[PDB]
Symmetry: C3
Subunit: 335 residues, 3 copies
Amino acid sequence: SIRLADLAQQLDAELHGDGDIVITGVASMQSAQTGHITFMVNPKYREHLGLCQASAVVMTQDDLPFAKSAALVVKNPYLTYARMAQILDTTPQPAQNIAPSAVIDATAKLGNNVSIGANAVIESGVELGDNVIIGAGCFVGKNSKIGAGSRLWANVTIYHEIQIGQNCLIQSGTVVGADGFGYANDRGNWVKIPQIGRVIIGDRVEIGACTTIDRGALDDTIIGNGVIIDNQCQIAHNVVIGDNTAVAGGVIMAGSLKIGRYCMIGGASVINGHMEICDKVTVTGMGMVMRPITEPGVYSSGIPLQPNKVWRKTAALVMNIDDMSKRLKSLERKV
Amino acid sequence: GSIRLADLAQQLDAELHGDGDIVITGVASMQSAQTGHITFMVNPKYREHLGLCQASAVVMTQDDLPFAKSAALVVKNPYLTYARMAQILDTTPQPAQNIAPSAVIDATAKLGNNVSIGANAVIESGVELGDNVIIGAGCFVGKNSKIGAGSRLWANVTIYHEIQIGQNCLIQSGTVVGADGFGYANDRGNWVKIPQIGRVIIGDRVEIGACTTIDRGALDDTIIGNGVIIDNQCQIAHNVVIGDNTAVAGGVIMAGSLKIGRYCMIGGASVINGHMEICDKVTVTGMGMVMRPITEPGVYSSGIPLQPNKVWRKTAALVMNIDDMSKRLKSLERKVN
Amino acid sequence: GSIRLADLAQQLDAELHGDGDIVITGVASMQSAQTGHITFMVNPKYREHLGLCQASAVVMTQDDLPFAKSAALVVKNPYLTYARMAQILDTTPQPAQNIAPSAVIDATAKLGNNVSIGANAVIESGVELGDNVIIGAGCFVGKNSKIGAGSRLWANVTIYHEIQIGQNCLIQSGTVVGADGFGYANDRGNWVKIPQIGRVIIGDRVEIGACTTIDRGALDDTIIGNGVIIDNQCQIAHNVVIGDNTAVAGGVIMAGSLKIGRYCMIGGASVINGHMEICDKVTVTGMGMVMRPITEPGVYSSGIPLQPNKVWRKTAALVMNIDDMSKRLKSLERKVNQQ
Ligand SMILES: CC1(C)CC(=O)c2c(nc3nn(-c4ccccc4)c(O)c3c2-c2cccs2)C1
Ligand SMILES: CC1(C)CC(=O)c2c(nc3nn(-c4ccccc4)c(O)c3c2-c2cccs2)C1
Ligand SMILES: O=C(Nc1cccc(NC(=O)c2ccco2)c1)c1ccc2c(c1)OCCO2
Ligand SMILES: [Mg+2]
Ligand SMILES: [Mg+2]
């Protein structure tokens, strides 16, 4: 719980109302009750602000005349919402102190205030920095290092020789450092190439659930600082992702892809390997990225949904487009 | 457990034609069935084949009866009867039995009657497990989460905090329920995490496949309706709502704040955009690219299917240059007219 | 781990050019190699660059040899030799060693010789682990499952009941083998679960990536042939059959009752529908949308690639209205045919 005046100060927002209002948490506009603070971004909600029952609403200056409650005025309500949600965060920690059922190799090196959940397994040589939290059931493989403040939720798998920076967050089910898909061929028989590279994850990286990041074949798979990666993503061996790039859910990346900084990869996209995407590129959902992207901007692919009867004709015509092309060329020649 | 054919027929509401004393030990495919097995025929083309079936009994329709070469259970719907008898004779073990000494269970957790918790499972403070709930080995159930009576989790399932799961649900291994949604604000190019303080509410009789992820809501909740079935490797983003009885096949990816109606069927590997709605009774075929809202019931499709590589190369190049093709067509139209 | 260069050359069947007494400690890339490392060159464009590589030895061909600036191992196939020497100098640890006191092993489980079981692994009744099997930490192996000699599971792998795995397999973390297929009947509008009492049969020398799922069959079995390699995030549905030596790249989804032949290559993120067959020696390029059986060997492809969004918008609009284009072209043909 926190006073609205204190909250406005920490948020660097201008208060318009009773600063002694006690705020207990954040809520959506439709769900907000007394004691909740909420926010609005779309001006369509201005007009039924008298139905919102929050104790305070974060809004812009143009929204203030429509306010029917105490208001915190700011330039960017969505960013202010992020900050106040962090102040009022109710999320528990993956673990507290070191659980007696955890299995920790005697040669592990633990910083101060390290928490390890029940039945987590820490291999030899592992280094956990100050304030690191390992959730229940995690595995952290030999000689891996996790920087100060980083947190793993339950049932995360970190392989051997992995480096993770400070203040990272990895959600459950994720696997970091599995073998890359590297094989030689000896007369039709696959010959495993041991993957003795690593994964280097920078600082302030957040990784979703059931995402896989393979280790490099010789050199390393590299995730830059401030990268965010959603659920169900596959990052193949020797991929390099530049700082602050965002990767949405279900993206599949092939090996040796290089992605620049400040990129945004839409969900379910497929990016082929041995190529580079430059800085400040946006790929929209389900993009089929076959070629390098050398200029910033927005890129898209795919033929969107149609009613099935219409699709049947669309797909049949598209598959025979070569004949349409030949017929057009013939007609041009005749005319 | 072995059962007498006459007793099995009564439980199935089938007409017995043959020896009710036959002992049935399990269910098998028609090609694999041996003595002691019961099987079923749904395709009348196999009537001439029944003499090659070694099952002790065969479920079939009244129209099939003259072709039987074994004891027969006559029913209106052999496929449904097969589902029912497979449940009666199910050989699937339970994920756990009793409470394993290696399980770690917070003192404040509330266990109902006949709850089983497998080895090395972890149960946090405030958790409530209803009667007959089974938690598989290596599971994690987060703080204050509630799992309704008769629900079962296979091994290595992760339930985060404040999750509500209904009665008689089944969740396969590797699935994660309640992870943080992909919620971030942008501050001059830096991503600022938005804590996801909503929950997930899963209804009754929901089945979730393996390695599926269902994210918790940002403020309000991610909601899975009653009777929903979800296959493997699906991603259900924060604040998605899925209506009762909807089926989601494997590998479907949904964006945040999507609402899917009741009675829908989403084909495997489909991709659905966020902040929009799909109405009731919509079927999206496999690999559907669902970019816009769907406001009328029916079947919808997308995608250009496979061709020989030599042919695809021309197809792809021509489609990508279709604007030029369009211009040439109009130009020729003007010239002819 | 470390080996004299002469002995390494002998085991690789390589021709040594240089000091056989050099001590090699591991493998490294050309750019990263330092004293004690062996590296390899596959691209002759780097011949001029070999003076900058500080590896102690370089694997190369006879045509590269005049350009060497180090001890050299000459072979016909530098890439295959690199695979073999990386195995010889492999630094990858084992998932486990010995039997961990925190593992929970049913009294009726049967273990061969030199079995290792990692911390907090769970082994159900009736399980059989062959000689030299390694079960990583946190794994679950369900009732009556059998794992053949030399096979290894990394941490947090889930094997359901009645699963059969062959010899010298390798399964990466997070993978689930034997979960229920997606089988349901319809009772007047209510889903009715069909118990999935088939199994999964995995052959010998199969490698499966991370967070891959392989469902069990409804009555008969899901079958993975010998020498198959499967990447991360793959979905193999109930009753799929995959022939020997086929490779499945990451993110591939296979619907139920699909049969794939031998020596196939399925590109990443492909979607393969079920109740159909793909013959031997078929290559499906990435993101392929397979809706019909493939009856002839060769390479098959689908998908419209990326364009700038403003260009894509026009392309998508024209394609979605291609029926109108077709009709206009036919009408124009009639006019040109004087009809
Ligand atoms: C629930 C049910 C008993 C019936 C059903 O509707 C269904 C089932 N299994 C499916 N597998 N795949 C699939 C999986 C992977 C790749 C490609 C396709 C579908 O698309 C499936 C569908 C659907 C078809 C159209 C909409 S949902 C079993
Ligand atoms: C098995 C092998 C040694 C050789 C191989 O053929 C192959 C390999 N790795 C791949 N990654 N991806 C991929 C992954 C993610 C997104 C897009 C593509 C492919 O498509 C891959 C392929 C194939 C190409 C064509 C058919 S399979 C390594
Ligand atoms: O693409 C993001 N999500 C997302 C997830 C899953 C599926 C989709 N489907 C589509 O787009 C889609 C379906 C059909 C056509 O298109 C999108 C996305 C990107 C960047 C972000 C972000 C979300 O939130 C944080 C800010 O950065
Ligand atoms: Mg334990
Ligand atoms: Mg996918």
